[PDB]
Write an enzyme that holds these catalytic residues in place. Sequence first.
Site, PDB file in Angstrom:
ATOM      1  N   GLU A 111     -21.433 -47.793  35.478  1.00 38.19           N
ATOM      2  CA  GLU A 111     -20.215 -47.007  35.443  1.00 38.19           C
ATOM      3  C   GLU A 111     -20.425 -45.679  36.169  1.00 38.19           C
ATOM      4  OE1 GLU A 111     -17.032 -46.640  35.642  1.00 38.19           O
ATOM      5  OE2 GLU A 111     -16.591 -47.572  33.703  1.00 38.19           O
ATOM      6  N   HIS A 138     -20.809 -41.911  36.778  1.00 39.41           N
ATOM      7  CA  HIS A 138     -21.423 -40.853  35.982  1.00 39.41           C
ATOM      8  C   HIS A 138     -20.441 -39.688  35.824  1.00 39.41           C
ATOM      9  CE1 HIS A 138     -24.169 -37.978  34.354  1.00 39.41           C
ATOM     10  NE2 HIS A 138     -25.260 -38.669  34.633  1.00 39.41           N
ATOM     11  N   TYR A 139     -20.022 -39.406  34.585  1.00 42.23           N
ATOM     12  CA  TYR A 139     -18.980 -38.410  34.330  1.00 42.23           C
ATOM     13  C   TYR A 139     -19.543 -37.015  34.093  1.00 42.23           C
ATOM     14  CZ  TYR A 139     -15.249 -41.860  34.328  1.00 42.23           C
ATOM     15  OH  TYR A 139     -14.349 -42.839  34.696  1.00 42.23           O
ATOM     16  N   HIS A 170     -16.132 -55.352  31.664  1.00 41.43           N
ATOM     17  CA  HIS A 170     -16.354 -55.405  30.227  1.00 41.43           C
ATOM     18  C   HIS A 170     -15.151 -54.822  29.479  1.00 41.43           C
ATOM     19  CE1 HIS A 170     -16.870 -51.066  29.746  1.00 41.43           C
ATOM     20  NE2 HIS A 170     -17.627 -51.067  30.828  1.00 41.43           N
ATOM     21  N   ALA A 183     -17.618 -48.802  22.085  1.00 42.46           N
ATOM     22  CA  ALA A 183     -17.604 -47.964  20.886  1.00 42.46           C
ATOM     23  C   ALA A 183     -16.987 -46.597  21.163  1.00 42.46           C
ATOM     24  CB  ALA A 183     -19.026 -47.802  20.337  1.00 42.46           C
TER      25      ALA A 183
HETATM   26  O1  LIG Z   1      -4.851 -39.686  31.153  1.00 39.66           O
HETATM   27  C1  LIG Z   1      -5.714 -40.232  31.899  1.00 39.66           C
HETATM   28  O2  LIG Z   1      -5.620 -41.444  32.252  1.00 39.66           O
HETATM   29  C2  LIG Z   1      -6.896 -39.410  32.384  1.00 39.66           C
HETATM   30  S1  LIG Z   1      -8.079 -39.913  33.483  1.00 39.66           S
HETATM   31  C3  LIG Z   1      -9.002 -38.498  33.496  1.00 39.66           C
HETATM   32  C4  LIG Z   1     -10.250 -38.197  34.284  1.00 39.66           C
HETATM   33  C5  LIG Z   1     -10.776 -39.112  35.162  1.00 39.66           C
HETATM   34  C6  LIG Z   1     -11.921 -38.766  35.847  1.00 39.66           C
HETATM   35  C7  LIG Z   1     -12.491 -37.523  35.643  1.00 39.66           C
HETATM   36 CL1  LIG Z   1     -13.961 -37.065  36.501  1.00 39.66          CL
HETATM   37  C8  LIG Z   1     -11.956 -36.615  34.761  1.00 39.66           C
HETATM   38  C9  LIG Z   1     -10.819 -36.963  34.079  1.00 39.66           C
HETATM   39  C10 LIG Z   1      -8.404 -37.577  32.632  1.00 39.66           C
HETATM   40  C11 LIG Z   1      -7.228 -38.092  32.013  1.00 39.66           C
HETATM   41  N1  LIG Z   1      -6.470 -37.281  31.077  1.00 39.66           N
HETATM   42  S2  LIG Z   1      -7.128 -36.877  29.542  1.00 39.66           S
HETATM   43  O3  LIG Z   1      -6.011 -36.707  28.607  1.00 39.66           O
HETATM   44  O4  LIG Z   1      -7.807 -35.561  29.465  1.00 39.66           O
HETATM   45  C12 LIG Z   1      -8.202 -38.223  28.980  1.00 39.66           C
HETATM   46  C13 LIG Z   1      -9.542 -37.984  28.732  1.00 39.66           C
HETATM   47  C14 LIG Z   1     -10.340 -39.026  28.299  1.00 39.66           C
HETATM   48  C15 LIG Z   1      -9.782 -40.279  28.123  1.00 39.66           C
HETATM   49  C16 LIG Z   1     -10.652 -41.427  27.651  1.00 39.66           C
HETATM   50  C17 LIG Z   1     -10.073 -42.498  26.992  1.00 39.66           C
HETATM   51  C18 LIG Z   1     -10.868 -43.547  26.564  1.00 39.66           C
HETATM   52  C19 LIG Z   1     -12.232 -43.514  26.813  1.00 39.66           C
HETATM   53  C20 LIG Z   1     -12.795 -42.441  27.478  1.00 39.66           C
HETATM   54  C21 LIG Z   1     -12.008 -41.387  27.901  1.00 39.66           C
HETATM   55  C22 LIG Z   1      -8.443 -40.519  28.364  1.00 39.66           C
HETATM   56  C23 LIG Z   1      -7.649 -39.478  28.798  1.00 39.66           C
END
Ligand SMILES: O=C(O)c1sc(-c2ccc(Cl)cc2)cc1NS(=O)(=O)c1ccc(-c2ccccc2)cc1
Lengths: 237, 233
Positions: free
Chosen positions: A88, A90-91, A10, A14
Amino acid sequence: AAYKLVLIRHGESAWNLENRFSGWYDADLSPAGHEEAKRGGQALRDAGYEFDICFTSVQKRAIRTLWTVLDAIDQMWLPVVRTWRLNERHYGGLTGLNKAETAAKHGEAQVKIWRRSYDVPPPPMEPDHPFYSNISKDRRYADLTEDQLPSCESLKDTIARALPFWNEEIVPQIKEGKRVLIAAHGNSLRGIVKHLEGLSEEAIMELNLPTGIPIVYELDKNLKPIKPMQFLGDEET
Amino acid sequence: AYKLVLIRHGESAWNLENRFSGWYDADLSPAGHEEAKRGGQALRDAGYEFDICFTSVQKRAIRTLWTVLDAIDQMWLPVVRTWRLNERHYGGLTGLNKAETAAKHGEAQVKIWRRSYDVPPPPMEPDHPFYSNISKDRRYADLTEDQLPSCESLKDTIARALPFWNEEIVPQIKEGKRVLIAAHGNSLRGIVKHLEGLSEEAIMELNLPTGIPIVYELDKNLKPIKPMQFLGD
Ligand SMILES: O=C(O)c1sc(-c2ccc(Cl)cc2)cc1NS(=O)(=O)c1ccc(-c2ccccc2)cc1
Ligand SMILES: [Cl-]
């Protein structure tokens, strides 16, 4: 080849616009994500694809993607099976936090660890979490056993609960000759692709499936791909 | 005290509901879509919850169900589609308006078809513009030669709807699952006739309104305890 399988992830949701972790939170497609699904469906239509059964998750961003595709290919009459096992990842306690809140609360070291790890889960979603009842108490999971309803998942956990659905419900239909369409999410589809291609943990963690794009597998009778995955669409995409 | 909800789809494209749409897979018009939205509205206001949904293989019914599920935030529900809930097959009349029907077959014969429970219309023949479109449609490929109609009396329609109701819907109701059924005028007539034990004449006089939830309250033997009620304002 003997068999043909189509996957679709997908598009934008939002909460993507809010860069908040969704996970099992049931965020809808944004207007752009909906248009992405329309274009993917138009691609399937121009190529003349036909399906016999569809699988999706219990999350509306995937279900709406599937609906949009079925509308575009004039196959709204097909049987559709929904399962939590295609949800998806679960975070956990990160559900609902944005990028800034996550970094603020946990530090970039901890966040980097979660990002690059295959088997380290995020914190659990506790009863005082703002979306705990919204998700964990949703009647759509009423029939899950206590050990089935996750409080949090590593990528390993996500794959481990997606692959039983693959083996036990999708594989039989493919071997029955049914043309399958799966409309789901990044990490559940990762589980499927990891099984299909025998990928390593590092390789699957480096794989980022494009969104709203039909992904085509040609499979021999044992469901081994005979060539790399192919993306459908105009030349640009 | 089981709860059962039916909904009949509204207006289809190109005025086809006044043109014996039958087994032609007409989509909803924008107005018919708006109608389904209002019905979903009504169900959500009332706080209705379902556990399983049944619909036909025709997209005007399917899209009606989709619109309701969207409006009540229950798109995750399981959905079963079956040809046995299809609209009545009107045979050679399919696609003709009332004037063309009269011009082609005459007022006397048309009145006989209108009032008869067991006299089908003429069959859809290969010269009909919908013949291959419907009869060679992939979604019916598994039907036996006796099962794929070329035309149906009302009797025929109810006769093929009732086996699905008895074998698939009844057991779900008896397990306590709250059932939603999105279908068409004549297949829903089949369900209602069986529920209320109506006569042929009575069922031919009953005209279920479109886009409105129809609520039934059934006892342990699936007999309605009170008249059907409608949901709205
Ligand atoms: O940069 C990166 O790709 C990732 S992936 C990741 C992560 C993966 C698995 C776990 Cl369990 C925990 C963390 C952390 C980062 N860094 S982040 O700056 O904090 C960040 C935090 C949220 C988003 C986002 C963007 C759109 C929709 C939803 C969230 C993007 C980035
Ligand atoms: Cl569906």
